[PDB]
Amino acid sequence: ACTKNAIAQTGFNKDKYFNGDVWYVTDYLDLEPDDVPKRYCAALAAGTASGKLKEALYHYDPKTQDTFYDVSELQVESLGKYTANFKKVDKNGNVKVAVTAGNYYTFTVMYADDSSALIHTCLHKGNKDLGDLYAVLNRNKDAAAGDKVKSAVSAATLEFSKFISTKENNCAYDNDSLKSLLTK
Ligand code: HEM
């Protein structure tokens, strides 16, 4: 179940966030903690491709080796708040599972600056969801969360100390695939 109406950043700068570059998940918190593993790797690219607002996702479970990419088309609900479809693809953009009505996620950018961000997502696959999932992002895959984003976690009435870090998992990412997937 998802339970939060996440509030987007006041004055969110869409073009800076959606610039075509990669964001790495450094820390995450699911309000239903059992919905996601204790150790995980995730990243995304976000940009406009031929006029269309896009995200490309990467998930990797470093214990099981479960790997998947997605390409997402975002629709705007309000500034910094989106509803995304998703198609599962290989790293080259070939479709494995096509876009379907019931497979979507919401995506809210609660805080962003040039180097860091805090997002909320509620994933739906048909009647199932993956809970309220918060993620701290950085442009540098090895960056410890700094004061701007940690303060934003506090301003969301959350505690950064309770987030799970991805840093001890030897995460390695294919940036090139994430950037190219934006076009697919
Ligand atoms: C960065 C933001 C994220 C977004 C927008 C997002 C989005 C999604 C989407 C769209 C899927 C379904 C993919 C498909 O079936 O084609 C998915 C699956 C999943 N995600 Fe995320 N995700 C993000 C981060 C994370 C993180 C940090 C974790 C933490 C462990 C996570 C754990 C999972 C798991 C375990 C699944 C598989 C769900 C199932 O099997 O039904 N995700 N995610």
Three-state secondary structure of 56-109:
EEEEECCCCCCEEEEEEEEEEEECCEEEEECEEECCCCCEEECCCCCEEEEEEE
Q: In angstroms, rounded to a whole number, what is the distance separating the alpha carbons of residues 160 and 93?
A: 35
Write the DSSP symbol of residue 42.
E
Q: Does ligand 1 come within 6 angstroms of the Cβ of 42?
A: yes
Reference 74, options 112, 37, 46; nearest CA is: 46
Binding-site annotation, residues for heme: 59
Structure tokens at 87: 């198609």
Which residue has a Cα nearest atom 3 of ligand 1?
121
Structural domains of the chain sorted by starting position, each given as residue range(s) with its CATH number in brackets: 1-184 (2.40.128.20)
Q: For residue 85, how far is its CA from the centre of ligand 1 (angstroms)?
A: 13
- Three-class DSSP category at 123: strand
Q: Which residue has the tokens 């809210």?
A: 108
